[PDB]
């Protein structure tokens, strides 16, 4: 499997025998979906980033308010066999051959996250056609470099060191329910293509048993999942 | 920001469950660059080009970890535990930023060199005969997403602190270790990479950094300098 996906909160702070250089144990996200996708060669970009860079979009539906969202881009994936309970697989990814899945294409991901204009599941597809909301991380956030399995995180402002101090937090400081768009691109000589897995993790405040995010590269299909999600 | 922390197998902490690993105390990151078409140092699986990295370990250790990452991109000013090869330095940024493979097959084989001035010649001889454990022969055929190949002692205690009470004969021996690395098609061993080599010493035992080089003669020069230095 993939490496564990960790929030920015520190669970333990054990100072290693003698050496003042210490070891902080991060708290893992309680709710993680790994989305396995595939960008076919010459596939048109979903959009443009930084003027001229080909960007591709994933859409995430977050149904309750959260403490944090973490996003990791790993590529390529190779074959993974039968997906597990935490895994989702794109059609393109299914149809892709083992060889196709095992070809590397890029390494450093520029990730942008933007909240879209959608108060309700049923606005998702039009929200996707619409401009993002025009503030803090739950409206806009960008990490221009993501290498070696690092994350892009959407955080509340002024987060405490102790995860447990989120018990106290005011609702109005938490990240809002809604539709978020992940844009990803790269730098030459890389190009965004082939297999990849976007791990998305949510952190809920202490005592709130989480719900999993819904994720899809297709806003109509996510919307159906989200429309169906709310009336089940 | 550099590389992820290189972790040993020893569990430092456990809780609510996910476990926190003890880092290696003595770590060196070897930034290298395999030139297009470069002749293999040897063959693996009847159809794979393998490349060799030589590690000298002067004293007994509790564990060694090897992580292979590729490509690296540009890295900025090398830090206090970074070795950077001339090939890597001569490579362009574009060259170091192109990926070429993602799944590494690693072997670690001990070579028959009891002292520094055997190193160069030992590299030319077969590995020590491989039960003999991890510190003679170890292989991990798949290393993806920054996973490690570890050379471990057999029947280790749960608690690292209990290593202070271990019999010496159980610890991993001093010597010359060859790291082989190759890959599966469609990838190929090409371009930039960083091999992170971590040592775990038993507690109370000050770490000594591993000496690492792709050229055994060069490694031998360094091992020799280090040894005669200690008188
Ligand atoms: O062609 C199949 C051989 N295969 C190794 C088996 O996993 C790929 C190596 O390049
Ligand atoms: O296939 C996919 O999932 C994509 O295009 O992002
Ligand atoms: O650059 C190097 O040292 C190599 O190929 O191992
Ligand atoms: Cl010894």
Structure characterization notes:
The structure is a homodimer. With 232 residues, the first copy, chain A, is mainly β. Chain A has one domain (1-232). In chain A, 12% of the residues lie in helices and 36% in strands. Chain A has helices at 91-95, 98-101, 124-129, 219-230; strands at residues 6-14, 23-28, 31-39, 47-49, 53-62, 68-74, 87-89, 110-115, 140-143, 151-155, 178-185, 194-203, 214-216. In chain A, the strands form three sheets. In chain A, strands 4, 5, 8, 9, 11 and 13 form a six-stranded antiparallel sheet that branches. A five-stranded mixed sheet of chain A has the order 7-3-12-6-10. In chain A, strand 1 and strand 2 (23-28) form a beta hairpin. The longest helix of chain A has 12 residues, at 219-230. Chain A is globular. In chain A, 42% of the residues are buried. At the A-B interface, strand 1 and strand 2 of A face strand 1 and strand 2 of B. The structure holds 2,2',2''-nitrilotriethanol (211), oxalate ion (2 copies) and chloride ion (CL). The site of chloride ion has 3 residues of chain B, from loops. Residues 59-60, 174 of chain B line the site of chloride ion. It is classed as membrane protein. The entry lists the keywords core jelly-roll fold, membrane protein.
Keywords:
homodimer; 232 residues; mainly beta; six-stranded antiparallel beta sheet; five-stranded mixed beta sheet; 4 helices; globular; binds 2,2',2''-nitrilotriethanol; binds oxalate ion; binds chloride ion; signal (chain A); Lipl32 (chain A); LipL32 (chain A); membrane protein
């Amino acid at each position: 499997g993939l490496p564990s996906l960790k929030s920015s909160f520190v669970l333990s702070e054990d100072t290693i025998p003698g050496t003042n250089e210490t070891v902080k144990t991060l708290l893992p996200y309680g709710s993680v979906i790994n989305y396995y996708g595939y960008v076919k060669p010459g596939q048109a970009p979903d959009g443009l980033v930084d003027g001229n860079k080909k960007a591709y979009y994933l859409y995430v539906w977050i149904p309750a308010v959260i403490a944090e969202m973490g996003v990791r881009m790993i590529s390529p994936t190779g074959e993974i066999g039968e997906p597990g309970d935490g895994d989702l697989v794109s059609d393109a990814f299914k149809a892709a051959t083992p060889e196709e899945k095992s070809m590397p294409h890029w390494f450093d991901t520029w990730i942008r996250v933007e909240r879209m204009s959608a108060i309700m599941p049923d606005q998702i597809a039009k929200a996707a056609k619409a401009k993002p909301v025009q503030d803090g991380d739950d409206t806009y956030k960008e990490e221009r470099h993501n290498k070696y399995n690092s994350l892009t995180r959407i955080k509340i402002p002024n987060p405490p060191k102790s995860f447990d101090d989120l018990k106290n937090i005011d609702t109005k400081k938490l990240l809002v329910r809604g539709l978020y768009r992940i844009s990803f691109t790269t730098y030459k000589p890389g190009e965004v293509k082939g297999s990849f897995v976007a791990s998305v993790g949510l952190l809920f405040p202490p005592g709130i048993p989480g719900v999993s995010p819904l994720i899809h590269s297709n806003p109509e299909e996510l919307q159906k999942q989200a429309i169906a999600a709310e009336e089940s």
